[PDB]
């Protein structure tokens, strides 16, 4: 999914040397997602490079039986800060462009999110990845703390 | 010798070093470096007197009557 297409410029003695930068995320909508960034002379080629760079950068988002987040989380990348919190089933995904495409492509069905701090697409994507990467699923906190699930449930 | 850490001895040592410094402040008035110190030390003595007034009223009034220290600015 192509998030953003921009025309960046290098300048040479001749004139303006034009390129396209594409920010693109890939997902299966099944709980596997990644971000990637690419650069080329043509829209198509940059799209493609972005595709590959993403595929080799990819990770997995912890999910809950209802297709949502384990818990509430913040994240920080550059000047982009990102706020995610779990939702009740049937609320859909409500968020802004970068965060929303990332989460939607991960396959998260119900999520609250707001990017605070900056607006830049790319950074917000990476921040979202940082968020959902640090998410701890309950089985694993049970295993870490060394305490049975039902005891933390209460 | 008595208590060299006691409230009343410390306040005495301060009061005395102050009245000793007053003479040098008079002969040379253009030494500010010294006066800055005098203000510091006088500040310490004032502090201990206030503390001592909080803790014990009798010892305090006895002391500032004894060493001829001016009555406090809380009135």
């Amino acid at each position: 999914n192509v998030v953003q297409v921009r025309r960046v410029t290098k300048v040479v003695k001749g004139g303006k040397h034009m390129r396209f930068r594409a920010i693109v995320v890939v997902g299966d909508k099944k709980g596997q997602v990644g971000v990637g960034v690419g650069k080329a002379k043509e829209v198509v080629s940059a799209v493609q490079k972005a595709a590959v760079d993403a595929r080799r950068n990819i990770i997995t988002v912890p999910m809950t039986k209802y297709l949502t987040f384990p818990h509430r989380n913040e994240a920080d990348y550059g000047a982009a800060r990102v706020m995610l919190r779990p939702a009740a089933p049937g609320t859909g995904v409500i968020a802004g462009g970068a965060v929303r495409t990332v989460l939607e492509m991960a396959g998260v069905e119900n999520a609250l999110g707001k990017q605070l701090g900056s607006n830049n697409a790319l950074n917000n994507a990476r921040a979202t990845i940082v968020a959902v990467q640090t998410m701890r699923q309950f089985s694993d906190v049970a295993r870490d703390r060394g305490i049975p699930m039902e005891e933390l449930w209460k | 010798e008595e208590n060299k850490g006691s409230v009343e001895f410390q306040v005495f040592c301060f009061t005395n070093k102050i009245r000793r410094l007053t003479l040098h402040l008079e002969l040379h008035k253009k030494d500010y470096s010294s006066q800055r110190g005098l203000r510091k030390t006088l500040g310490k003595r004032q502090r201990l007197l206030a503390y001592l007034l909080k803790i014990n009223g009798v010892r305090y009034k006895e002391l500032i009557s004894k060493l001829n220290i001016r009555e406090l600015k809380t009135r």
């Binding site: 384990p70 640090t134 906190v141 703390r145 449930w153 | -």
Partner: protein, 133 residues
């Protein structure tokens, strides 16, 4: 040292971020209790006491590095809530729970210090010392 609690918490956070298992903290009823609780929750490996020149030091072993020092998925977070400038209190029904309960909340109440879980069983509110992830 205007606040001792925040200080303990802080030393822990610092030793933790630096990937060191061992911490020296200064002991106190609050300190000791807090650490006890920290152990029965399973956030910290082991604790013990030392004494020199009438000073008490609790040394704390900390949970080992996660499958290397470099690739860490998890850190261990601590946050002061009620602090000398603003004291935060809560009744029974406002008692906080951290990340759906995965973490814990420390309460100082009438019956002593405890977790939010204990407060919920016994039905007491009180002063919230800190949050622990």
């Amino acid at each position: 040292g205007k606040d001792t609690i925040a200080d303990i918490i802080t030393c822990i956070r610092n030793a933790d971020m630096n990937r060191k298992g061992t911490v020296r903290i200064v002991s106190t009823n609050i300190t000791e209790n807090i650490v006890k609780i920290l152990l029965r929750e399973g956030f910290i490996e082991n604790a013990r006491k030392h004494q020199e020149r009438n000073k008490y030091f609790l040394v704390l072993t900390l949970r080992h590095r996660r499958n290397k020092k470099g690739p860490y998925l998890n850190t261990f977070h601590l946050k002061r809530v009620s602090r000398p400038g603003l004291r935060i209190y809560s009744n029974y029904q406002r008692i906080p729970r951290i990340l759906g309960g995965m973490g814990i909340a420390i309460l100082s109440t009438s019956r002593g210090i405890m977790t939010d879980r204990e407060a919920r069983l016994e039905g007491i509110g009180g002063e919230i010392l800190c949050y622990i992830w």
